[PDB]
């Protein structure tokens, strides 16, 4: 997250931190995700597409820091790793950039809700807030485009939903953005998601409830003028989600 503010897991208790083990045994951060039910975390397919073996991944819930333990955290293996069959990627856009991870502990359990671990509601079908609505994004991604390191402490910021029309302007992304995506940006371009935030939550208040409106997917650079963050539009994937979690 470029700009914004440091936070803790209490302020986004559905946030999932997804890591990969390496042959040799190092573990590195991969992507964020969102707990949508006790056994299911939702994220982005591009986070996994290159290394799609489920045994390689570890998921933590209740985590506020990247490389140290948070009191109350829970660690999970990935029982099922489900990537979207229609995923595709070009120079820029990632299409159908959505993935589901079924989580299970060494003790065979799903998530136990606590002060630091809760689920986030899915939106209702094809129902998204209007452009100019402020929403929040959360992640462990870079604080500056040029940074080599990821921040050790979780961050969040606020960005505004941008119309499809605006986002499809050629100086923006043209037709790379589809109706299955949502654009969001800061009016001054001063805050944004960045590398390492992918898979994490875009959350908007919708009918007075907090709703998983989007999933961090792609963009050109970070906090770059005329180049919004692009998010998978969750309200357009509900059949896929339900069908794959039943």
């Amino acid at each position: 997250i470029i700009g914004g503010e440091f936070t803790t897991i209490e302020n986004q208790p559905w946030f999932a931190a997804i890591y990969r083990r390496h042959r040799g045994g190092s573990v590195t951060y991969v992507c964020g995700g969102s707990l949508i039910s006790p056994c299911w975390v939702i994220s982005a397919t591009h986070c996994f597409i290159d290394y799609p073996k489920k045994e390689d991944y570890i998921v933590y819930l209740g985590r506020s820091r990247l490389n140290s333990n948070t009191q109350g955290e829970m660690k999970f293996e990935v029982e099922n790793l489900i990537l979207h069959k229609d995923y595709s990627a070009d120079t820029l856009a990632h299409h159908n950039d959505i993935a589901l991870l079924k989580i299970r502990s060494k003790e065979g359990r799903c998530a136990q809700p606590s002060r630091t671990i809760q689920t986030i509601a899915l939106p209702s079908m094809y129902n998204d807030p209007q452009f100019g609505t402020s929403c929040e994004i959360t992640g462990f991604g870079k604080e500056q485009s040029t940074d080599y390191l990821y921040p050790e402490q979780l961050k969040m910021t606020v960005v505004k939903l941008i119309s499809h029309r605006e986002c499809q302007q050629p100086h923006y992304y043209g037709s790379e953005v589809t109706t299955k995506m949502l654009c969001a940006a800061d009016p001054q371009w001063k805050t944004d998601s960045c590398q390492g935030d992918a898979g994490g939550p875009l959350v908007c208040s919708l009918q007075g409830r907090m709703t998983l409106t989007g999933i961090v997917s792609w963009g050109r650079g970070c906090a770059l003028k005329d180049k919004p963050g692009v998010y998978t539009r969750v309200s357009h994937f509900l059949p896929w989600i339900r069908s794959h979690t039943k």
């Binding site: 990969r20 992507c31 996994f48 820029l92 590398q195 992918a198 963009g219 970070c222």
Partner: peptide
């Protein structure tokens, strides 16, 4: 390889 889209990518 400093962008959203390229997290956990081999090519990078």
């Amino acid at each position: 390889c400093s962008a959203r889209g390229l997290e956990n990518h081999a090519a990078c």
